[PDB]
């Protein structure tokens, strides 16, 4: 009658948070978020995540690879799987009554994967390309390496199965990796365009595993790594970081505003044909903060340098309490905006319904970002300039400097 129906959350006897929210859209979308990811891999089993992420369409026990794909399509369905170093989100979307049917397949894909030894042994050669396409984006390249140079142990592990292991992942490493991370405590049957009483009556079938935290990913030790990739692309990609900020970590929001407090500065600080921005990643027990600078070859040295001086003199008092007001607002924006699209939105009611079990209303989420400002920032920057730095780089580089050259 106004379209408002408070998003009910009801933690099952397992640890399976069930978040819905009937927003009345014609097309609703259900999603199974998990605390899985490439953070829980060891020197071996590497990329088993990635592969897994692809084995999405492989036969289950309730429905065949065939049925599933044509099943979902015979409804105008859409199954897909988005994952990050520390979390895999299995979404699915459709409309009307078809949500009910669209489920059977999502249910099976996430709990009854009988990864047949052939299907996978015939699916693995996909990694070669799935990766090959993603790597056309130089940006993804540098980052993959960044985390490598930023860490040493879990998390620093690649997001796209390393080459050497392309066809060595075993059908076993897949079950074993699932049996240990796809467990009630670390899952969330989130969803939209749905009545919660229904989205709940489904978690009943979804009750097939308990093991709270099966393999828990090791804490992430930091490292001041530096790994250059000489490849002459006429234009260098560079990133620098200083470990910091963690999701839920009160010290978070600060950078966010520093993320914005920064940008117009580093950019407007480096004249010529380029691009540069403030880098920020907040992970479960760690994070990162810095800046990537896509810049022409020979003008790569200069670019990063200047970009840096700025993050520098940003800590040494060059931040009007105005810069903060403006930036404090942009986040209010980028936050709210990137919530319009039910997929970037269902991504929010999920992330939280997973890491916390709560739901910070748009009101306080502001009151929290509003909450700090002058108070930090200037300082959040300082943290960068002092701590240890880890750089990543792709490009001609012959003109690009090393961290030991600040």
């Amino acid at each position: 009658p106004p379209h408002p129906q408070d998003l009910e959350i009801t933690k099952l006897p397992n640890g399976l948070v069930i978040a819905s929210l009937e927003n009345y859209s014609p097309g609703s979308t259900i999603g199974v978020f998990i605390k899985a990811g490439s953070r829980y891999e060891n020197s071996s089993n590497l990329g088993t995540s990635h592969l897994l992420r692809l084995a999405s369409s492989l036969t289950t026990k309730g429905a065949s690879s065939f049925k599933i794909t044509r099943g979902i399509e015979a409804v105008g369905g859409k199954l897909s799987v988005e994952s990050t170093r520390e979390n895999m989100a299995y979404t699915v979307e459709c409309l009307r009554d078809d949500v009910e049917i669209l489920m059977e397949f999502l249910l099976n894909v996430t709990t009854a994967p009988e990864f047949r030894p052939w299907e996978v042994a015939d699916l693995q050669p996909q990694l070669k390309i799935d990766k090959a396409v993603a790597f056309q984006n130089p940006q993804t390249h540098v980052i993959e390496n960044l985390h490598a140079a930023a860490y040493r142990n879990a998390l620093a592990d690649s997001l796209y199965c390393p080459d050497y292991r392309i066809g060595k992942v075993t059908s076993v490493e897949l079950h074993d990796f699932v049996q240990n991370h796809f467990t009630s405590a670390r899952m969330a049957l989130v969803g939209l365009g749905v009545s919660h009483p229904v989205l709940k009556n489904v978690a009943e079938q979804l009750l097939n595993i308990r093991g709270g935290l099966g393999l828990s990913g090791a804490k992430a030790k930091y490292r001041g790594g530096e790994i250059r990739e000489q490849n002459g692309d006429s234009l260098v990609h560079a990133a620098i970081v200083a470990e910091s900020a963690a999701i839920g970590g009160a010290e978070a929001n600060a950078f966010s505003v520093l993320q914005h407090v920064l940008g117009a500065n580093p950019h407007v600080k480096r004249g010529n044909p380029f691009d540069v921005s403030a880098f920020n990643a907040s992970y479960s027990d760690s994070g990162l903060f810095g800046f990537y600078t896509i810049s022409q070859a020979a003008y790569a040295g200069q670019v990063i340098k200047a970009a840096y001086n700025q993050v520098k003199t940003i800590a040494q008092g060059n931040v009007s309490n105005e810069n903060v007001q403006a930036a404090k607002n942009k986040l209010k924006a980028k936050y709210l905006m990137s919530v319009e699209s039910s997929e970037g939105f269902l991504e929010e009611v999920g992330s939280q319904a997973l890491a916390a079990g709560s739901y910070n209303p748009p009101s306080t989420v502001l009151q929290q970002i509003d909450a700090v400002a002058d108070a930090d920032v200037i300082k959040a920057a300082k943290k960068f300039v002092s701590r240890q730095k880890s750089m990543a780089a792709s490009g001609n580089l012959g003109h690009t400097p090393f961290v030991d050259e600040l």
Binding site: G27, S56, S65, T69, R70, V75, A326, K332
Partner: protein, 442 residues
Amino acid sequence: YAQALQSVPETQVSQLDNGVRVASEQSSQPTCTVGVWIDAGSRYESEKNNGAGYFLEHLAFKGTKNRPQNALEKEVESMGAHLNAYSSREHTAYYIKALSKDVPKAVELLADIVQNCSLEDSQIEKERDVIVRELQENDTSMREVVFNYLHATAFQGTGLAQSVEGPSENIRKLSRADLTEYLSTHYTAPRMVLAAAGGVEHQQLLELAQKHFGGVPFTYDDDAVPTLSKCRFTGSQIRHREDGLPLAHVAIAVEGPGWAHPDLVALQVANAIIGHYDRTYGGGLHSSSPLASIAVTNKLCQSFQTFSICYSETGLFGFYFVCDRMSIDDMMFVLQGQWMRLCTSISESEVLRGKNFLRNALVSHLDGTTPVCEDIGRELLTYGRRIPLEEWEERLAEVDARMVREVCSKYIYDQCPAVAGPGPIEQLPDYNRIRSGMFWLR
């Protein structure tokens, strides 16, 4: 569900004694997006006028006279709004996205651009060499050049054939003037639409537009919108070979009806049935879309997509694929074959899915504020009003097999298509061959 559609907030629309049409959709959403969608484009350009619409889009932000560069941006940045846009062949727009708490501020901004652009002769001489570079980039995006070339030959000789970007020679010589000659000529209320979506209350919008768009039409001309010169479709081909490239692209198509035409529905459903593939998917088992299946089994293409790109009074219903120098043929064959199948022996069980597949994109076509405004921005401009998802629903919730057949055949069977192909295409057979691929040896 159907109830979900129905309970969907109607879109408000009301024009000015000026000419502008002001419409939009309301929700709870703090955020929003708003924009002016001009009936402007490349199609509206001349042999020496080609480019402007672009060279324009590229200065449409670098300021106004009221508030020069550093300030506009600073005023935009500073409030956290995103002012983005484009310019096609018969459509240009400029939308911003703020917190709805800025309707009146965003609106003003809008008006201050579509009406007063700095066009700093010194700003231009820079954006000049910027485009000429930015164009040199658009160039190795074979994924595109293949389409312009398609237009180029598909509508050879007419206005559409000219690429939204325009020749280097024009961008190298457009005058401070010619740009203005473009602005003052096409940027007029009767052809412009103020649309928005989010938490906005129409009236507040109206009044602000009705307030910052203080336009006044004297003559009968000013109040009249010119209808465009018809573009001759020309079944033909254009081949820009180069075995030096990783692979070749191929794009073939038949003339499209034009937005107006009710068949664009059934037709849209058509394209739903063969859809698109792209090696990352996960389906040699795919839904009917054999083109997809077969594309897998016999490793036909890197990726293929079906499209019914349409315009005011014409269109381009075809398909585009990317494939190794070597499997180009088998692909066409299999593909082009599908069109036939499609309009010679298509089944209900097929259309059933097609529909739902469309009804899914139909809905997700409107996902957020920016996108919604797009339709509204568009809808009005090309259709006349706004087509509700409740409507589109019926439109395509009533297309049976026999209807698809009757349609596709009507625009594909024994029609002379236009093919375009850049890259190592030595393997693509001549025209006659891909031509006699239009009729099924029934």
